[PDB]
Amino acid sequence: GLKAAQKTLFPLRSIDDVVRLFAAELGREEPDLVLLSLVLGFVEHFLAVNRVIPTNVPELTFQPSPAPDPPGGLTYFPVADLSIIAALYARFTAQIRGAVDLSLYPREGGVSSRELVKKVSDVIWNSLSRSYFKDRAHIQSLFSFITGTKLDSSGVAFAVVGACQALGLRDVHLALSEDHAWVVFGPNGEQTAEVTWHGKGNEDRRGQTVNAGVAERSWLYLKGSYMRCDRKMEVAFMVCAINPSIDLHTDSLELLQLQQKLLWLLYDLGHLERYPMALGNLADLEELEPTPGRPDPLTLYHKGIASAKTYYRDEHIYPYMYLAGYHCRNRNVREALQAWADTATVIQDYNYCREDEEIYKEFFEVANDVIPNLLKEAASLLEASALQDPECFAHLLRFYDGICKWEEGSPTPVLHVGWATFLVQSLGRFEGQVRQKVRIVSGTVAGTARGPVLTFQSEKMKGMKELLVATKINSSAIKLQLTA
């Protein structure tokens, strides 16, 4: 089943040997996801899931080598016998070709039927375990699917797509929003399908189209500006899905190096170009263990925002959140609040819907914890500045503005009284001398002939442009406005 130009690259005995398989498979026209997944799942298993070495399995072997830092003597790596990997591969392929026969699916010249795609979906879906928790670590790979029958929400879609490549259908691809996954197929790849569940609720819309979610202007579907993958991007996804987590507090060094390396590989080949989030992931990784001759983290977060704007109508939230993070951690309040504000700038043109709970929570953390904590910390650092910069106060306001605009036209109310207390308290963190140097102008003249300035877009935030800039912050009042 495997081609010989692949076989030869085995066996793999180090992180580097793995990279070779990826650099090499990535230079073909049709990179084998099933193969790459399996290798990745296999490695990730003995490295993160079951680190104790079996001494009674003469087929499984490990490979010694000097340990990275002065700490330690020898580290062991799971040798990927061609035999083991090829056996899994075959087993997967059998399941598929043997549970679906293309005999009855006439494909007019390189297209797949909606019945065929929904079938391959079902094949994989019914192949899934009955007894497991859908949020657990290390069930993303097909290694997982084939070995344990366990696969996580995103993993299922990846699986369906790998399955199709196995059947030869080369028009089916992974669709990736920031919090979901589905499939795109047809000529020019404009036809879509739901293949996996979303969120805690096993509520699926399998066989249905995304059209309805894009329509309702929810963030799950990114107003139609979601990623449409190609084999090369899908390989990126896979590399991003590598979970180096041994424990809630422990991480596998080798799995980190491996995932960091493989991302660069993908970067040099330019395949990260349309994947903002992957650029972020690479960023964060570097911050912790930089590699020589490579760009700074900060450089990368931006390459990420660049990508967002260019290829996705700047409609993606995470590339700001990623950057906001970096500063917040690196105690750079100014730059942090800026980026959080840029975030709300995107969110404002959406609607908060049922399935958007993930992002709701991500703002709620910023609004009600992370921010009131950088501020608290700032009120103590001057007493022993930025807490006295108006532009920072505008950043905060603009942030709240976006969040108010979001709420507008939405099914569920975003704001409730609990948001208020931390608004009131964050304002109060700024001296009235400062909260007044900010020009809250609506607009002089439009168009053009031939302190800092701030214009509100939310009717809510507009109605308070005065209360925010008082010398005494009217608690009781701001509350009753913010909620309505």
């Binding site: 996580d152 929400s153 920031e178 991003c240 994947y275 964060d284 959140m321 990623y322």
Partner: peptide, 8 residues
Amino acid sequence: RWXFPARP
């Protein structure tokens, strides 16, 4: 344990 892949 599990994030959406590449989440921040």
